[PDB]
Swiss-Prot record:
The keyword Transmembrane does not apply. The gene is HSP90AA1. This is Heat shock protein HSP 90-alpha. Its main location: nucleus. The chain holds residues 15 to 223 of 732 of the full protein. The modification N6-acetyllysine is found at K44, K70. Belongs to the heat shock protein 90 family. One of its GO terms (cellular component) is cytosol. It comes from Homo sapiens (Human). Molecular chaperone that promotes the maturation, structural maintenance and proper regulation of specific target proteins involved for instance in cell cycle control and signal transduction. Undergoes a functional cycle that is linked to its ATPase activity which is essential for its chaperone activity. This cycle probably induces conformational changes in the client proteins, thereby causing their activation. Interacts dynamically with various co-chaperones that modulate its substrate recognition, ATPase cycle and chaperone function. (Microbial infection) Seems to interfere with N.meningitidis NadA-mediated invasion of human cells. Decreasing HSP90 levels increases adhesion and entry of E.coli expressing NadA into human Chang cells; increasing its levels leads to decreased adhesion and invasion. The lineage of its organism: Eukaryota, Metazoa, Chordata, Craniata, Vertebrata. Residues 1-209 are annotated as: Interaction with NR3C1.
Amino acid sequence: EEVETFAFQAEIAQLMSLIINTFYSNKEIFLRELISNSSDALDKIRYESLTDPSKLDSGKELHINLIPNKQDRTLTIVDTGIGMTKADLINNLGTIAKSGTKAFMEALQAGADISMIGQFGVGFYSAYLVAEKVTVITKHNDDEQYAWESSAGGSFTVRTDTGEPMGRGTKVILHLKEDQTEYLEERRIKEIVKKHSQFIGYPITLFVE
Ligand SMILES: COc1ccc(-c2c(C#N)c(N)nc3sc(C(N)=O)c(N)c23)cc1OCCCC(=O)O
């Protein structure tokens, strides 16, 4: 406390189980999905900045940072996008995930594979292909800083983040599974970004250790 615990809607909990328990070797797709979500959040603040330029008072730079940390076994994806309010964070992290899960779970029977997850607007959950726990720190102009967290298992927590303020944006912290540490390696991250994120309209900085 003051930590609020919530149950995932039944379909999202099932989707997370499917992602965690399905044998699927092409795990690298998680990075493309998170970067594309960060790209969308950055387009949103850019669209709002055209009408109201004071939306950029919380930070003018529009970028994506990829931060690996071998000591903590984390891969962090930071964007200075629109960010999420507490309600956005609680409402399936600002999506229609309940309907998207239906169409995706249906498509997986119709011949589709896990790599097509983003076409159903639930690409965020592919983080669970590599992460045993996901922490999302977010700051929206119209709200305070919040930390969302889940190790799956049907629940998630939400608390006010009293940590390092970030002005505006979202930080997706992937606490990697013990067998997924290749995603902490520079050449591996660089290869994935080059393969799946070559035409992202924002600078992508890969931090070094
Ligand atoms: C479970 O799905 C998502 C879960 C989280 C996000 C997210 C991420 C990520 N990762 C991010 N870095 N920043 C933001 S700002 C924001 C908002 N204001 O709402 C988001 N929702 C959002 C997007 C998600 O689906 C988007 C595709 C689908 C679509 O087009 O809505």
